[PDB]
Nucleic acid binder design. Structure first.
Lengths: 151, 65, 65, 116
RNA sequence: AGGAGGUAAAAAUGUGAAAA
RNA sequence: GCUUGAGUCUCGUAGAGGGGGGUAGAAUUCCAGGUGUAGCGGUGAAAUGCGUAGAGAUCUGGAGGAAUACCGGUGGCGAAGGCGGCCCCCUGGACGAAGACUGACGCUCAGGUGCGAAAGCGUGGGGAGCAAACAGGAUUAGAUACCCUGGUAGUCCACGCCGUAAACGAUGUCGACUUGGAGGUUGUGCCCUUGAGGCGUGGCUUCCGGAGCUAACGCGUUAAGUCGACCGCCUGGGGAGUACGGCCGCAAGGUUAAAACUCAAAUGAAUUGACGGGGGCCCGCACAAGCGGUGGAGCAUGUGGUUUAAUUCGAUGCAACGCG
């Protein structure tokens, strides 16, 4: 809680190319410790995202990631006061990591399909900034511009 | 730690309002002797001479007039 | 407060604010007076502050530096 | 309307709200402000960021009259004195004099007691 | 170093004999 | 008669010393007029109250009063209390280099008298801001408390009365003697004034301590240290600084001031842990940033309550409760 910080953690990406970037989606798309069942699904979840949004797997993800990429985050800080909030802009390390948080959060809903085919909807949605993960990214945008009264 | 009317004795008055603009700061406020180096009865006497200008409307009550 | 900085006022120059007003005396001049509660407070706090003058004059201690 | 040229801005300020009266060298004031008329009711009403929007109520609804070069004359307290004034600067006007002129007393009439 | 501003609302009763 | 005791005078220093009266501005409060807007206000939170009658609000002006932001300091005066915007009138006590003079007029003092912050009362006022009792509104177990908005007396002035404190440096008054060091303040002497200077000589105080003293903390040149003088106070706590009576007070009571009775305590410093809705620092997933379980449901299990012939017994936050 107080003093020492470790560096980076080491996860294991998809078996076509070494990509810690895309693995952070995949390891959070990894449900229940199952890389395997994810490995059947996250490729099919990448099969639907890329060539239906337009780009190949290098930059098709930031079609559905930079659009869900936030810029503002808020948190409550008092120095001894009226329990108010002192917000800051977040660094690159957590910002697009928070962008990956909404997409797996949007992965659960819209259920008449498979987990493969539930991920097909929102990744195609988040590509053209019409995403339900992007919808939660648009809620975090409105927690700025009026709730920054302490700094 | 400055030199004054301690051992090289002198007088200080109310008429010299320009020097009496120095023993107040630049709003009309009498700064304590503690910062300006002067002495207490060399200010307490002058405090009446400050107010004798404030009675005679030369160094103000306030900077809103 | 009495600042114009005639044509360029692009920088605020707010250093006559804090130690003179707007928080400093403004949190100490309004109420809670009793005419001698400051003599229950000047005798506590300035004696805690004139010893803050004196504790640097008794500076030689268990440093060994 | 008269399109008053020289104005005198009296930010009659407090911690929570402020009845700013947008006067002239005469004193006549068609424009106004409160931090409560804007709103943000509750704890957030005790903000000079709301007095900024009140000073933004001094920065709109008078563009029809064009309140040119002005004397900022703020009276009263407020611990956020880098929020209320520059919104009046944000109006596109000019501040001729930046004055925090307050009626500082000589303690004539009796004050009561508080903080218990 | 020399000095200022922001600094606390909810949680009570243990009513009676326990040591060489 | 003398003089180191006390006092007077010459030459200088200082300020809220005390009583009274003139006179100024800012702050704030009410109001008329121009302009003008739907909110103003307050707190831990909220509401009350107020505003469309045109409030809060800006400027000009009229009508008010007391306290004096900064100057302003454990600095000054005095018997204490207490008293500070400026000036004027009357008047007061103290300190010192250097001398004259009366020639011990010195010290304290129950009775008696006067004064005394503050609150209260009687007669007439200041009457703006604040403000016991009071109403409304939150918190709340009751709130008849802390808090907010108005508001009676009061805070201010004249003459009397009550004559009371934490009137606290809790240390009565006067005198003498008794290593000091660091500052504030008013005096001031010898020397080359040859710069804010070298070295001494008194008073009023803050801090650390030797001698000495003390239960300890600690006092320490204003001593709780070394002695003498006068007045006052004390005799276990509580009961009670109450009651009968007396002096005095219109009143409220003050003051002198017991007893019956009960207990074997009461009171004070310090020691070591504990406690704080005191703090600094450090630690633990205490928390902030997350995923999945417990709690809704079927099933598997233990105790309690209950019923009963017993539904062995014990444990009964825990760390007994899928325990023996």
């Amino acid at each position: 809680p107080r003093r020492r910080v470790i560096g980076q953690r080491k996860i294991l990406p998809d078996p076509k190319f070494g990509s810690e970037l895309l693995a952070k989606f995949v390891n959070i798309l990894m449900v229940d410790g199952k890389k395997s069942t994810a490995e059947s699904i996250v490729y099919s979840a990448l099969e639907t995202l890329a060539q239906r949004s337009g780009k190949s797997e290098l930059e098709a993800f930031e079609v559905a990631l930079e659009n869900v990429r936030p810029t503002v985050e808020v948190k409550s800080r008092r120095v001894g006061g009226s329990t108010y909030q002192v917000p800051v802009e977040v660094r690159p390390v957590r910002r697009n990591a928070l962008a990956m948080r909404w997409i797996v959060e949007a992965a659960r809903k819209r259920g008449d399909k498979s987990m493969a085919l539930r991920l097909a909807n929102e990744l195609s949605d988040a590509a053209e900034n019409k995403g339900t993960a992007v919808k939660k990214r648009e809620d975090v945008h409105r927690m700025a511009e009026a709730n920054k009264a302490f700094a | 730690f400055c030199r004054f009317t301690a051992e090289g004795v002198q007088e200080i008055d109310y008429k010299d309002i320009a020097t009496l603009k120095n023993y107040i700061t630049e709003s009309g406020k009498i700064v304590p002797s503690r910062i300006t180096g002067t002495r207490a009865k060399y200010q307490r006497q002058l405090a009446r001479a400050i107010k004798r200008a404030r009675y005679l409307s030369l160094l103000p009550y306030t900077d809103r007039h | 407060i009495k600042v114009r900085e005639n044509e360029p006022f692009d920088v605020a120059l707010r250093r006559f604010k804090r130690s003179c007003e707007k928080a400093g005396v403004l949190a100490e001049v309004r109420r809670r007076e009793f005419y001698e509660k400051p003599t229950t407070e000047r005798k506590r706090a300035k004696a805690s502050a004139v010893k803050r003058h004196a504790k640097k004059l008794a500076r030689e201690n268990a440093r060994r530096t | 309307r008269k399109q008053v040229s020289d104005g005198v801005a009296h930010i009659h300020a407090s911690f929570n709200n402020t009845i700013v009266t947008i006067t002239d060298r005469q004193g006549n004031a068609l424009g106004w402000a409160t931090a409560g008329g804007s709103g943000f009711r509750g704890s957030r009403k005790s903000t000079p960021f709301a007095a900024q929007v009140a000073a933004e109520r001094c920065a709109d609804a008078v563009k029809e009259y064009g309140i040119k070069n002005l004397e900022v004359m703020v009276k009263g307290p407020g611990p956020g004195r880098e929020s209320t004034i520059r919104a009046l600067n944000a109006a596109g006007f000019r501040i001729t004099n930046i004055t925090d002129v307050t009626p500082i007393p000589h303690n004539g009439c009796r004050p009561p007691k508080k903080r218990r």
